[PDB]
Design a protein around this ligand. Structure first.
Ligand SMILES: C[C@@H](O)[C@H](NC(=O)OP(=O)(O)OC[C@H]1O[C@@H](n2cnc3c(N)ncnc32)[C@H](O)[C@@H]1O)C(=O)O
Ligand SMILES: C[C@@H](O)[C@H](NC(=O)OP(=O)(O)OC[C@H]1O[C@@H](n2cnc3c(N)ncnc32)[C@H](O)[C@@H]1O)C(=O)O
Ligand SMILES: Nc1ncnc2c1ncn2[C@@H]1O[C@H](COP(=O)(O)CP(=O)(O)OP(=O)(O)O)[C@@H](O)[C@H]1O
Ligand SMILES: Nc1ncnc2c1ncn2[C@@H]1O[C@H](COP(=O)(O)CP(=O)(O)OP(=O)(O)O)[C@@H](O)[C@H]1O
Ligand SMILES: [Mg+2]
Ligand SMILES: [Mg+2]
Ligand SMILES: [Zn+2]
Ligand SMILES: [Zn+2]
Lengths: 321, 161, 206, 203, 327, 165
């Protein structure tokens, strides 16, 4: 069952063809049409995608495609309406079905890929820049937003508190890197909405707390501030994921997103799982968990269950689970 | 030719309440440039503004990664954050297209960047951070919109005495 | 011939020749482009009982207008023709609007862009449609200058009607004249860009 | 509200409105009228989940043009509304043609009739349609004599393009002004009848 | 099973409703709402052969009576006829189907004028031959147990009717020609002149009648001193002759005992006499219409409707009219 | 009686000779024009129409006296229109029905008994009187106004080919 999957949600404009959601037949991505061709520009979907269909149908014969998948949310109306509007019209001219991918649904999925034999009663925390969130994944694979930031992503907190500290890009790597030298129990920074009946986060609390210190104070070590603040983010995260994995009753726990990558998260999460006896999960090494392979897979499993979308389907840029 | 209206040491509450007063006395296809630095309290301003269009504050969030959040209410507020902007084509295409809608209100965290792009008649809102719990704000009201100034001014002398 | 022209510049406009049959269909209503364009294409094909690989050339309104509309129109065309490298007829949405007027002589086509500017071009129409002013962004007032100068017999303002018949007739004409392109080679007419410079040099003048 | 309108005065123009939605369809070419019209109306109503008995008004092109064209069109209309006395709006095919042309101005409508004569009218497109010269027949010289006088912007000659979005608008209007009529009250404009008169009076 | 049907083939405009076959609940016509048009006054009026102006009123009267809800099938003459005359009844009929969400049948006026044989004899085995001799047609057909009917004979030139009508005018007698020729040919000598029998002892079933029309035109140009009824009766027998020998030499050769007549020409005194004589003397079963020439109303098409619908042999909405149509 | 158009008389044409020239008269015209057959009953008007149906690429077996049909309509290279107005009462059939065929400038009209309503037909109309001589041979007078020309040359041409054989 060849799914032809199309990406117009991320900044790499991607087209992929994936037999049976496993064996990948061709992967073309504009990103890899620059040093393998060393114009066609960053994320100019409507200009790029055409060339990638050109590149795809030169190799894959047109017939063979069985489903056309393509993300419809979340992303930007303009971006989404190019992969989606284009995939709809493939469907028409292939006389094949089309599947709208919910991206954050698909994101959550590849967890079930990073271990084939991983059983699906499970709680995901998604800590990106765009997204901060706790979810249920029911044994049937039914998800719900239970926890959601009300202001800022953990990703955004990290990137700006980095900026405030005269540290480089990217936000987190730099703060992770340089807190290694510091004292995370050095400044008693606030942990907004902890010890609560809510499963929700706020972070703009922190960004300001740090900024107010940086202004008022002086003589301070940068590491020490960087360590102090990373712990206050990790305390609020690590508490909620495990307060809720208990409160409902789950032992296997998934960590998706960029903030995922944090050495002090992975170390603190680990001394909780190694001590209540819980199975703890992370994504792959070269995190590009965002190709067209993603949405091909997504749309395979969808079509597998004859869950197709109609040619009326509009983009939803605010789409969640 | 445009009246600057300064507000000295405002509570997090009053800040939102100024924002709601600006935004209910708006009429059509209007740009609110939000000038301020990291922490100023821009996003918090918009929280106050969305009140005016009948939706809940809780659906206001840094569009720093999303780039655009859209509050389709009594009017539809488009909310931009240029903090992350890398492709100026977003402005030349997407934002030019947003501007063609004349029954809806634009508002731009860091609309003091890419100055050439924005209109002559754009409303400018510098937000400053005078206190741990107070922010000073200056609303500039281009003369082709003095219908605001009466309405905003009321709140300037409604606060002072 | 089998021809599919569309133009989703303004409201939706779709022409379809099967050999010696011309169907035109246009939708004007609440529903967004992506909600309705593709649907109709499917239904209209599924009714003339021909498939896309049967089409000899496909027209597309690429030229100046509503962004979310064009982005959808060009995208769905790319979706349709890409499997079989079907020849594409790029159609100038203004040039179309003008041929869709039934008349003789001097034509101004205008659509109100941002705050205080228009997209605008000016057309001499005897027979072949010859361009006096090529399409371009002008100010509210540079429009009234352009009006007096070129001095139109005909002005098509903001609510621009397009004959799907005309889309086809041109798509056919460019096919015959060998001026069709591959769906990879399209370039939409985004006048939106050239606004933000006219702004910079109106705030400079102080 | 729910509105079907159609003109068969030259070729098939069908416009349907269901509250928020207005489709327009035109068929041109080989297939004869009775072959295409009934079919396209059925396929169309079907797609909009719309039974006939739910139309507020149906409009029909009666105005000057081809007999078997109009005959088919009217009759077809009379079949749809006959069983529920759905109000019929008469529609003038020259008035409908003039109201399709984007331009305002003095706008000649003329239709190469019987091989040396034209069907012909001259309209003033302003606020509404100010009727200058009523639909009637003329000589090939008598057409220039007209075109000399009213010296018009737009010659809508021989290819009378009718937008169907127009036919709907008109019907919608006529329903409101009570200017609707019954399915048995329909009275076509057979200008043709008035060509034998003005030629048996020439020889 | 209420099947609405509509005539618009040539001159008559008719609408009729018909319940399971011959069970009439309306057969309205422009012809009978002409005598009833001096009654009170005059406003919502029918012309005469103005099908478009009329069909709307006929339909109205009908739906005042018969709530349309209960119409289950709709059927209208598709051909043969005047393309214009037909396109009204047809186009309307299809619309009536579209509105009422009920299926449509485009009937054959021929397959109809032949089925009208069964309306006047329900007790009538259908393995029979039929001679249609109108002005319009002059034909021999065969109806199967099935009821399917191929045309087997055909004039190449004029009808019997057309030759009667015209030779009448050549002899300066009334319209319609035939009746007058029949009436006068009575007091005249059927064998005083021997005209041709164009196509007799010819190895086909096809008629000719342009040979007669002239061989009389020639005769009168030539001969002064002659009785008019002589020529009448002579010319008339030349036709009875060619009709009867074709009709039978086919009912016989196709092995069939039973044999029916249709067309105002069927009215003819001399035809009937000599058909009756032959079939008394071959024990063949002959039929006729009565003497009430009304072979053009909507009861026919309503039935061909009930008949083709009971057989689920339905019609598509693309369906054109066919003026040049037969069986 | 007096139509000062252009004579083009023949004489003693066999039945076949008449169809052959009828074939020449119609194969020498692209669309738009009208032909008025005259002559008393049995003159060969219908028969003449059989000559014409060759030009459009049909055999004549479908030409039949259209006296009750009013308009037999024969499609070919040009769609030929065939009318017998012998039996006409309602003149609203010319007002409307025959008029709406004159609108078609691509096809050919031909009319048994046209002289019956003379003056409703347009001035640019061709006439074909069919007089009668032997029981086998007929005389025929084709007319052509000033409106038509090129034919009076093409006609008097064929006269030779199969009148000297
Ligand atoms: C809508 C879409 O944009 C969004 N994805 C996204 O925002 O990118 P993602 O790669 O998942 O997360 C990026 C963030 O991940 C943070 N990050 C990367 N490495 C980190 C580390 N070692 N420690 C703390 N944060 C880190 C970066 O600071 C950066 O802000 C999504 O997943 O919904
Ligand atoms: C297409 C339509 O026109 C045709 N019917 C028709 O032409 O009318 P109808 O009623 O069937 O018969 C008309 C012919 O019937 C002849 N006729 C009537 N009574 C006659 C009689 N007693 N003797 C000889 N001919 C007679 C008339 O001369 C006339 O030509 C038809 O039913 O197919
Ligand atoms: N008087 C006041 N006015 C505004 N915000 C105040 C305030 N006192 C405290 N705050 C705090 O300021 C924070 C508001 O953060 P934001 O509005 O997200 C700053 P921003 O301008 O959006 O920063 P950014 O540049 O990072 O986007 C909240 O923690 C809020 O409670
Ligand atoms: N030289 C000739 N040319 C034409 N027809 C001839 C002829 N000699 C004999 N005929 C015969 O004349 C007959 C004329 O028949 P038609 O043409 O069908 C009737 P018509 O002359 O049109 O008049 P009508 O319509 O008033 O009945 C034919 O049977 C034909 O064979
Ligand atoms: Mg913000
Ligand atoms: Mg004849
Ligand atoms: Zn994602
Ligand atoms: Zn009959």
């Amino acid at each position: 069952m060849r799914v032809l999957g199309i990406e117009t949600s991320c900044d790499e404009t991607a087209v992929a063809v994936l037999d049976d959601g496993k064996n990948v037949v061709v992967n073309f991505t504009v990103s890899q049409i620059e040093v393998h061709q060393k114009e066609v520009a960053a994320r100019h979907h409507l200009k790029n995608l055409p060339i990638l269909l050109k590149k795809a149908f030169e190799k894959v014969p047109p017939e063979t495609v069985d489903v056309v998948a393509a993300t419809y949310g979340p992303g930007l109306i303009g971006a989404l309406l190019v992969g989606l509007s284009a995939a709809k019209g493939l469907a028409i001219s292939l006389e094949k079905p089309f599947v709208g991918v919910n991206h954050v649904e698909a994101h959550v999925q590849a967890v079930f890929l990073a271990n084939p034999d991983l059983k699906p009663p499970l709680v995901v925390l998604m800590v990106s820049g765009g997204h901060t969130q706790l979810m249920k994944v029911d044994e049937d694979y039914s998800m719900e937003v239970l926890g959601e930031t009300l202001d800022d992503s953990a990703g955004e907190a990290f990137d700006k508190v980095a900026r405030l500290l005269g540290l480089g890009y990217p936000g987190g790597p730099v703060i992770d890197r340089v807190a290694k030298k510091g004292d995370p129990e050095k400044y008693s920074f606030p942990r907004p909405m902890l010890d609560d009946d809510s499963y929700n986060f706020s972070f703009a609390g922190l960004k300001t707390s740090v900024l107010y210190f940086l202004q008022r104070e002086k003589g301070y070590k940068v590491e020490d501030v960087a360590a102090s603040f990373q712990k206050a983010v990790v305390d609020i995260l690590v508490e909620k994921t495990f307060r809720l994995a208990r409160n409902l009753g789950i032992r296997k726990i998934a960590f998706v997103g960029g903030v995922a990558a944090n050495s002090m998260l992975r170390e603190e999460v680990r001394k909780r799982a190694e001590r209540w006896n819980y199975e703890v999960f992370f994504p792959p090494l070269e995190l590009c968990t965002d190709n067209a392979l993603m949405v091909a897979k997504a749309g395979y499993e969808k079509a597998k269950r004859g869950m197709f979308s109609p040619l009326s389907l509009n983009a939803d840029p605010n789409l969640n689970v | 030719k445009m009246r600057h209206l300064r507000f000295e040491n405002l509570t997090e509450e009053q800040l939102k309440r100024l924002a709601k007063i600006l935004t209910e006395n708006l009429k059509g296809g209007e740009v609110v440039i939000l000038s301020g630095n990291l922490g100023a309290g821009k996003t918090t301003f918009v929280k106050g503004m969305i009140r005016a269009i009948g939706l809940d504050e809780k659906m206001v969030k840094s569009p720093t990664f999303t780039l655009m959040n859209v509050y389709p209410g009594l009017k539809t507020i488009y909310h931009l954050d240029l903090y992350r902007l890398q492709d100026t084509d977003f402005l030349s295409l997407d934002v030019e297209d947003i501007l063609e809608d004349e029954d809806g209100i634009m508002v731009v965290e860091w609309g003091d960047l890419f100055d050439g792009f924005w209109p002559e008649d754009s409303i400018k809102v510098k937000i400053e951070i005078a206190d741990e719990s107070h922010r000073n704000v200056e609303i500039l009201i281009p003369e082709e919109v003095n219908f605001l100034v009466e309405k905003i001014e009321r709140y300037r002398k409604e606060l002072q005495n | 011939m089998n021809v599919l022209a569309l133009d989703t510049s303004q409201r939706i406009r779709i022409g379809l020749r099967k050999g010696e049959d011309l169907f035109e269909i246009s939708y004007t209503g609440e529903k967004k482009h992506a909600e309705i364009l593709p649907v109709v294409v499917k239904k209209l094909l599924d009714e003339l009982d021909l498939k896309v690989k049967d089409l000899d050339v496909v027209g597309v309104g690429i030229g100046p207008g509503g962004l979310t509309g064009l982005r959808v129109g060009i995208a769905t065309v790319v979706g349709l023709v890409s499997p079989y490298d079907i020849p594409v007829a790029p159609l100038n949405s203004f040039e179309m609007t003008a041929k869709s007027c039934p008349a003789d002589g001097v034509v101004l086509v205008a659509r109100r862009a941002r705050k205080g500017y228009h997209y605008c071009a000016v057309y001499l129409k005897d027979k072949g449609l010859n361009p006096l002013k090529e399409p371009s962004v002008v100010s509210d007032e540079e429009l009234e200058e352009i009006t007096k100068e070129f001095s139109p017999k005909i002005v098509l303002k903001d609510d621009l009607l397009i004959s799907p018949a005309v889309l086809v007739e041109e798509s056919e004409r460019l096919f015959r004249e060998k001026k069709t392109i591959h769906y990879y080679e399209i370039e939409p007419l985004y006048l939106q860009k050239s606004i933000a410079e006219l702004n910079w040099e109106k705030k400079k003048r102080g």
